[PDB]
Design a protein around this ligand. Structure first.
Ligand SMILES: Nc1ncnc2c1ncn2[C@@H]1O[C@H](COP(=O)(O)OP(=O)(O)OP(=O)(O)O)[C@@H](O)[C@H]1O
Ligand SMILES: Nc1ncnc2c1ncn2[C@@H]1O[C@H](COP(=O)(O)OP(=O)(O)OP(=O)(O)O)[C@@H](O)[C@H]1O
Ligand SMILES: Nc1ncnc2c1ncn2[C@@H]1O[C@H](COP(=O)(O)OP(=O)(O)OP(=O)(O)O)[C@@H](O)[C@H]1O
Lengths: 509, 516, 509
């Protein structure tokens, strides 16, 4: 039962506890966080969505910041760490205006009015990339710089090439409607980082029933069944229990008569590849060797249904429903062995610009694999954004300093009470490059006040902050490029979370 | 960081001790501001809203908080007005460095940046001011009634205003000289009469009496000042007066006569006709026998002179004080045409001395009045009118009032912050926000909203000029130039220079130690 | 405790109920966060939502809750208007209680001043039917425009004002708020908000069944089920463990005939389309594609609840009870591609009293701010066609009643003079809290509004957009006269139940 200004200061002090914890984790030089899991595992990461998923705060203000990051992992992807820092300094600057006696509705509407000036300033200083032609060589170099922050910096060029082709497959460039849902990620322990492959289809980690099978399938004939071409075994467990010698010897009679009839069923139907849930017998794979019939063994439960959607076939539960209509289509079915490691994956490629890609990431350590899955999904939204909008903005804090100059200049043209909200929006927008200077091991104010002087005095285009300790400023030459939609929603969702907090003035439990 | 040693906590102790001085005096700003009540140790309660009295009655003991006390004392001698407004400027300045010191900025970088804001802040107040002339008598007359109308005495603001302008024109040559001394304009007040019965004496007027010298009128007066006590022979050491008979008792009375007459005969050789004796309490400055020896030589008797009155005499007639009778020369004498005692019905028994004819220009303003409360506020209205003329001589410029240069200073320094580099960009940003307290105080003291008034006034200054401000008479934002509220430039331009050197001195203080 | 101090203990429990809904007055009011025992957060600005979730334990505070419980069932909202008015009646008579005035004299003047409030409103209420020769369609487009003013859709407010007046026209004379649905989907521009005449859902059914299922139907039999037709379903399965190998063929066939006989009862009923909350597998969409039947599963139950009321059917869980008694009927059945997703909807029902309004936008805060203003704009245009005799809102009728009850107080001698004169100042809580919740200056507005009412202003009120005063009768901000009468009589009756109580009896239990 808290009301008044003492309840409002309880919300800002609770929200700044989330912001100041993640203020040090901004940028590539950000301090990583240790997380103690519930089962006793200890991992370390610098990803911003991973910190808020493990931060279990019982305060209701901190749970709204957790609710904020439920949607920005899919929308912007890159600005997860900075949006919490931008929302915290906005309430910190609102705390300065709270002692003056200002109602939060004028601040929430004043932050909304100042946000539209920063949105109007973002597209004016933007730059176009992909006009009038399609290309893949400059699109690689933009994704090659962003993925250098994690521990896959030694193999950051290989992930930049495959992520460009993966986004361009499931979507058309002229349609500018890209779906990230059709691109799935996977991984397993073992191998190296250079063995990450890209398939124009869906790849299953399942091997053949016989190593003497042919390594390529040129026919578009795939049979998807539940029981294998043998005496049929159930889907859960066999649990065999013989009765006597007459039961076991009659089983030998039943084994041989189905070894010739079930393989006869695949020829009158017209299929070539036999994908089934359970494996095949040791005597059954001899007849498949003569008549050129491949087969895949020991496929799991949900691994069957993901094959039939990409191949366009249907599930055949019994042998009586086997027809030519229930077959899937494919371009070339092969198997890839990753060097000396006997992996033998089921590689189902359509040999056409199709609507299904799955990138299979490898690695010699398990800590690198889950950190590369989020880094590839971070790179998935980046190339998705360039097709929908080729307009980009200069990153490295150059967009936030240039937007803060137009907001403070347009604050003098407002003869209302909301001018103090616009001037506080100018200093709060610059906290994202200011935390870039403190995390880089320099002075946070001396680096900030010299770049804003550089953007006014000698040159009108914006300059960035050399957080990687490079030669000088102007990160356009350093190839630090962020998207426009990732920046226009960075200042939007940070402002809208302040309006949801400033409208809350009472928590009752 | 570890931060084991803490020298910045004494800086935060120096800031918060000086912040309580300005915050307690903040609501007393403006004509419609709230008054302050004080209680003395004996139980006296005196209601007074003047800022120079409350800082004298606060009696602070902290060394950092004492720096705002002599800051108000230096404003009364340099400008003579603008007193509390320097403290609220210096108090809001140390509030702005509280946000700067938490950021990790060293105070010596703020000291060189606040001087750069002071050098730029003077340049904004120069071109926005209105230049006027000192030889024009209409400008000095009209601008003095407008400042005296907001004071306590406003019904006599049309009478004391031409008396203050005509006093400085006999002393200062208009539009040629720059130095103006207010000590050469003595204000003599006595009981009886009204304020309309006033006289501008070009010489000097004393409040004492020539008793018991029966001359009371001398021509060709050579005025001389003697600090030695012309009295009986007195020895501070052990002495004895031997007695022998009754004729010996008349001899020591003749010895007291002959010793004083030997000193009187030394005065007559140099041609001195008027003797001035300093006020002395520890011993008799003048005996009964020395009063009669100057009556025979037709020498006027003048005693009971304050030390401040001696300064008014030497700049008037050119008389130098002597310490003893053996150092009495003819070069230390003044010049006077006539000295007499004029006892009017309301002016009282005063010594009117005319005809100076000496290098030096002093004037005297004799103000009459019935009650004691009449003449004291008449002198405070004169000293408030004497300061606005002294402020116009050193700076031949005028500006609007009601905090209107303070809003223009907050807007031009914000535009100056976008063109600077380094640490100096944020210090002039905090210098601009610290100047907005003075219109926010005048917005709160006039009954308006403190935030909605200064925000509308900033947009009026971006499109217009310094004419927009706070009018306390009508209670709202209006044209200060059309409201005829005009203040001199030296009130504000010295309020910035004196407050900046105090903030630079306070931030440069690191540790406080006690010696013995 | 009997007498004076028992009334003071009841007058302080009245403040804690009014303070819970004091800031929620107006469309731009502040939100409240109420957290239950389970840990769920509820953010709402509605006063009836807060009072249902408080559950106060004080006996004198339970009276003001049950008055608001009767208000939402009959009128529909305005629970904060009857709470602040009943509270301010007590705070003005509170210094008169300690003077020695009897609480029955508070009752005898509350019955007099309420009857003067009814006679003044009915003499001042103006019937607006065809004023100045305007169309009735243009009148609801102007009154719903002020409900959407100062919002995030002010750029296209003329388009959204035409959407509310079209939705109220499609219903019958029985108008209600719960019959209209509002959907929130992400993507698209702000001006792409279309309208559906009937019930539509998001249609997340992404199973098989393409190149079939014709989307056009003239008079289909709408089937409403809650059955699962999946192959790996949790209710349709068979697990028989034996050693017999020809029985192994039987357990896979009989598991298929379990789903086949349940699908055969669907086609035997003659249902053209089937709807189900539980998902439908690929082998059931394959069976309906062979017999030319439409199918669409994975629909929400709340979307089915608006569907059974319009189509005239009912929900049946089992498939045995599917007959013509529960099958719904419609006339237009089409399929759109709004926002890239599939959308199934019915139009032309025999009981077509429900609709759905789909929202589009690039941010979720741009949608939730509109649906708070859309439900208010629906009840404004609902009250306009219902009650023609309306008065100006925004505290215009409260400042006029404060003028009429002041000069009439000076004409009545006795104890009713200082009480009804305090009753006029007690009605000032409606224009005063409109200024503080909007962040304006309550001093300068109310002093200008009361000075305008003495000169002849009878329709001037508090503007929530600007910090000005304006004629709300000419600005098309209206409220019905009968709701203002019912809010005034309920406020004086609730203030009577706190004053007339003199002692509290607690049974020892
Ligand atoms: N190589 C670089 N040079 C300069 N600035 C960079 C560089 N890489 C990233 N940045 C800046 O850092 C910001 C992103 O901060 P940060 O790296 O802390 O978040 P993130 O870890 O990418 O987010 P997530 O946790 O979702 O991956 C961007 O706004 C960008 O301007
Ligand atoms: N006639 C007037 N109309 C409007 N504002 C005025 C007027 N006279 C003074 N002010 C404002 O009031 C402030 C001074 O208020 P106050 O009378 O308390 O102090 P002061 O003794 O006159 O000056 P200081 O504080 O410098 O010693 C100044 O900043 C000035 O802007
Ligand atoms: N556009 C507006 N401008 C000014 N005041 C408004 C406006 N809209 C609503 N109000 C104020 O809000 C009050 C109504 O509050 P609220 O919207 O919670 O109840 P309601 O929805 O109107 O009532 P009901 O439950 O009967 O529909 C009115 O007294 C009115 O003065």
């Amino acid at each position: 039962r808290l009301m008044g200004l003492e309840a409002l200061k309880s919300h800002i002090m609770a929200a700044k506890a989330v912001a100041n914890t993640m203020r040090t984790s901004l940028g590539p030089n950000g301090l990583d966080k240790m997380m103690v899991d519930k089962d006793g595992d200890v991992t370390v990461t610098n990803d911003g969505a991973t910190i808020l998923s493990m931060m279990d705060v019982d305060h209701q203000i901190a749970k709204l910041m957790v609710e904020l990051s439920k949607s920005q992992d899919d929308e912007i992807g890159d600005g997860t760490t900075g949006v919490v820092v931008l929302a915290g300094a906005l309430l910190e600057e609102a705390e300065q205006l709270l002692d003056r006696g200002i109602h939060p509705i004028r601040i929430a509407d004043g932050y909304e009015q100042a946000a539209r000036v920063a949105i109007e300033h973002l597209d004016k200083i933007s730059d176009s990339v992909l006009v009038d032609i399609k290309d893949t060589e400059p699109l690689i170099q933009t994704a090659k710089t962003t993925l250098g922050s994690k521990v896959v910096n030694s193999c950051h060029r290989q992930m930049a090439e495959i992520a460009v082709n993966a986004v361009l497959t499931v979507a058309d460039m002229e349609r500018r409607d890209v779906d990230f849902e059709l691109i799935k990620v996977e991984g397993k322990v073992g191998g190296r980082l250079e063995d990450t492959k890209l398939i124009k289809g869906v790849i299953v980690d399942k091997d053949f029933s016989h190593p003497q099978m042919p390594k390529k399938v040129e026919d578009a004939k795939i049979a998807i069944l539940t029981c294998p071409f043998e005496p049929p075994k159930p889907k859960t467990k066999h649990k065999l229990d013989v009765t006597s010698v007459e039961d076991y010897k009659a089983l030998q009679k039943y084994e041989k008569e189905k070894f010739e009839e079930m393989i006869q069923q695949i020829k009158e139907t017209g299929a070539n590849l036999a994908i089934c849930q359970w494996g095949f017998d040791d005597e059954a794979n001899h007849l498949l060797l003569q008549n050129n019939l491949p087969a895949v063994r020991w496929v799991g439960g949900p691994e069957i249904e993901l094959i039939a959607i990409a191949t366009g076939g249907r599930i055949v539960p019994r042998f009586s429903e086997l027809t030519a209509e229930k077959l899937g289509f494919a371009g070339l079915v092969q198997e890839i062995s990753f060097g000396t490691t006997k992996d033998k994956m089921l590689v189902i490629e359509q040999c056409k610009n199709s609507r299904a890609v799955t990138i299979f990431i490898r690695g010699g350590n398990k800590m690198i694999i889950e950190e590369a899955k989020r880094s590839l999904h971070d790179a998935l939204c980046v190339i998705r954004n360039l097709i929908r909008d080729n307009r980009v903005v200069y990153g490295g804090g150059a967009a936030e300093i240039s937007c803060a100059l137009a907001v403070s200049q347009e604050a003098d043209k407002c003869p209302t009470l909301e001018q103090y909200a616009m001037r506080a929006f100018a200093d709060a927008l610059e906290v994202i490059p200011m935390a870039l200077s403190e995390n880089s091991g320099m002075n946070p104010i001396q680096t900030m006040t010299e770049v804003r002087a550089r953007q006014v005095k000698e040159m009108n285009p914006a300059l960035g902050i050399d957080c990687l300790h490079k030669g000088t400023n102007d990160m356009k030459q350093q190839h630090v490029i962020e998207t426009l939609i990732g920046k226009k929603q960075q200042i939007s969702l940070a402002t809208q979370m302040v309006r949801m907090i400033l409208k809350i003035d009472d928590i009752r439990k | 960081y570890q931060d084991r040693d803490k020298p910045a906590q004494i800086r935060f102790s120096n800031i918060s001790a000086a912040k309580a001085v300005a915050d307690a005096i903040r609501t007393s700003l403006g004509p419609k501001g709230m008054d302050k009540m004080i209680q003395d140790g004996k139980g006296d309660v005196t209601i007074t809203n003047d800022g120079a009295t409350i800082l004298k009655q606060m009696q602070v003991l902290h060394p950092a908080a004492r720096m705002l006390v002599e800051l108000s004392k230096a404003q009364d001698i340099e400008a003579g007005d603008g007193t509390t407004s320097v403290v609220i400027i210096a108090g809001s300045l140390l509030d702005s460095c509280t946000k700067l010191l938490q950021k990790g900025i060293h105070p010596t970088i703020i000291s060189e940046s606040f001087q750069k804001a002071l050098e730029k802040g003077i340049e904004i107040l120069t071109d926005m001011s209105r230049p006027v002339e000192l030889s024009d008598r209409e400008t000095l007359l009209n601008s003095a009634t407008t400042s005296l109308n907001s004071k306590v005495v406003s019904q006599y603001s049309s009478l004391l205003s031409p008396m203050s302008v005509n006093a400085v024109m006999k002393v200062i040559d208009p539009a040629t000289a720059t130095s103006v001394d207010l000590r050469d304009i003595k204000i003599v007040k006595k009981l009886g009469g009204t304020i309309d019965d006033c006289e501008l004496v070009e010489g000097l007027v004393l409040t004492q009496k020539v008793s018991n010298s029966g001359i009371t009128r001398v021509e060709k007066a050579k005025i001389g000042l003697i600090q030695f006590c012309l009295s009986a022979p007195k020895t501070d050491m052990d002495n004895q007066i031997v007695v022998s008979d009754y004729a010996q008792m008349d001899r020591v009375l003749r010895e007291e006569r002959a010793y004083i007459l030997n000193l009187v005969k030394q005065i007559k050789k140099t041609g001195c006709n008027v003797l001035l004796i300093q006020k002395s309490i520890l011993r008799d400055a003048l005996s009964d026998l020395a009063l009669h020896f100057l009556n025979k030589m037709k020498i006027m008797v003048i005693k009971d002179i304050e030390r401040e009155d001696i300064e008014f005499i030497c700049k008037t007639i050119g008389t130098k004080p002597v310490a003893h009778i053996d150092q009495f020369t003819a070069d230390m004498l003044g010049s006077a045409e006539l000295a007499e005692e004029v006892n009017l019905n309301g002016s009282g028994k005063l010594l009117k001395i005319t005809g100076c004819a000496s290098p030096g220009k002093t004037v005297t303003i004799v103000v009459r009045g019935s009650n004691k409360l009449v003449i004291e506020e008449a002198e405070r209205s004169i000293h408030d009118a004497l300061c606005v003329i002294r402020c116009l001589v050193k700076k031949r410029a005028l500006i609007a009032g009601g905090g209107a240069p303070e809003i223009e200073l907050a807007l031009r320094l914000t535009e100056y912050s976008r063109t600077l580099s380094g640490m100096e960009s944020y210090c002039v940003r905090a210098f601009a926000d610290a100047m907005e307290v003075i219109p926010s105080t005048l917005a709160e003291n006039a009954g308006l909203n403190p935030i909605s008034t200064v925000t509308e006034l900033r947009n009026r200054h971006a499109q217009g000029e310094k004419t927009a401000g706070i009018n306390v008479r009508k209670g709202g934002i209006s044209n200060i130039l059309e409201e005829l509220v005009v203040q001199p430039l030296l009130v504000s331009v010295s309020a910035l220079t004196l407050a900046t050197e105090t903030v630079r001195s306070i931030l440069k203080i690191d540790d406080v130690v006690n010696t013995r | 405790s009997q007498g004076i101090p028992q009334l003071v203990s009841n007058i302080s429990a009245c403040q804690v109920i009014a303070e819970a809904v004091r800031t929620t007055l107006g469309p731009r009011g502040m939100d409240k966060l109420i957290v239950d025992g389970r840990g769920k957060a509820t953010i709402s600005n509605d006063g009836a939502t807060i009072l249902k979730l408080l559950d106060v334990v004080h006996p004198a505070a339970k009276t003001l809750v049950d008055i608001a419980k009767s208000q939402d069932a009959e009128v529909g909202d305005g629970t904060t208007s009857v709470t602040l008015l009943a509270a301010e009646f007590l705070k003005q008579v509170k210094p008169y209680v300690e003077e020695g005035l009897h609480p029955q004299i508070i009752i005898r003047a509350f019955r007099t001043a309420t009857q003067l409030a009814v006679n003044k409103i009915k003499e001042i209420a103006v019937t607006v039917k065809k004023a100045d020769k305007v169309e009735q369609r243009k009148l609801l487009e102007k009154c719903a425009m002020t409900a959407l003013s100062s919002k995030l859709i002010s750029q296209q407010k003329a388009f959204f004002a035409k959407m509310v007046v079209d939705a109220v026209m499609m219903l019958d004379d029985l108008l209600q708020l719960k019959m209209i649905g509002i959907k929130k989907v992400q993507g698209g521009a702000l001006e792409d908000s279309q309208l559906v005449a009937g019930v539509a859902f998001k249609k997340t059914f992404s199973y098989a069944g393409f190149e079939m299922q014709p989307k056009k139907y003239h008079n289909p039999k709408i089937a409403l089920l809650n059955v699962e037709l999946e192959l790996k379903a949790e209710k349709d399965n068979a697990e028989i463990r034996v050693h017999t190998v020809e029985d192994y063929q039987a357990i896979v066939d009989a598991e298929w005939n379990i789903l086949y006989d349940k699908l055969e009862k669907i086609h035997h009923s003659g249902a053209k389309v089937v709807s189900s909350k539980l998902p439908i597998g690929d082998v059931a969409t394959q069976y309906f594609a062979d017999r030319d039947m439409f199918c669409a599963g994975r629909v929400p139950e709340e979307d089915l609840k608006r569907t059974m009321m319009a189509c005239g059917g009912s929900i049946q869980t089992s498939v045995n009870a599917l007959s013509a008694d529960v099958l719904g009927r419609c006339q237009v059945f089409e399929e759109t591609q709004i926002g890239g997703e599939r959308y199934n909807f019915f139009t032309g029902c025999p009981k077509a009293k429900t609709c759905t309004f789909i929202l589009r936008g690039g941010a979720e805060q741009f949608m939730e701010e509109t649906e708070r203003s859309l439900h208010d704009a629906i009840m404004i245009v609902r009250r306009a066609i219902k009650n023609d005799s309306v008065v100006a809102g925004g505290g215009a009728i409260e400042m006029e009643l404060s003028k009429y009850l002041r000069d009439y107080s000076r004409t009545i001698p006795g104890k009713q003079q200082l009480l009804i004169g305090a009753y006029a100042k007690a009605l000032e809580i409606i224009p005063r809290q409109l200024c503080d919740n909007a962040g304006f200056d309550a001093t300068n507005i109310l002093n200008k509004l009361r000075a305008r009412h003495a000169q002849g202003g009878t329709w001037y009120g508090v503007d929530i957009n600007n910090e000005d005063i304006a004629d709300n009768f000419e600005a098309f901000v209206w409220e019905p006269a009968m709701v203002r009468i019912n809010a005034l009589t309920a406020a004086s009756e609730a203030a009577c139940l706190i004053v007339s109580v003199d002692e509290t009896i607690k049974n020892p239990r």
